Amino acid sequence: ANQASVVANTLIPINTALTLVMMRSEVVTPVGIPAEDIPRLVSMTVNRAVPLGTTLMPDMVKGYAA
Questions:
Q1: How far are the Cα atoms of 1, 3, 24, 44, 61 from residue 49, in angstroms, in the given order?
Q2: Residue 55 and residue 65: Cα distance in Å, rounded?
Q3: Number of domains in the chain
């Protein structure tokens, strides 16, 4: 139901470390990483450019395990 996921608040460039202004929570479908995981994700890197408005999926973040 209203499960919020991490959504790219701005384009996240490839190989760039995640910061708090890059991430918002949104109820979207399909569900991606939970919004409660935003502080765990800070300083992790993505492995592909994530365009504005994309749901961050587990497989996009280098070193992410829940």
A1: 28, 24, 17, 14, 11
A2: 16
A3: 1
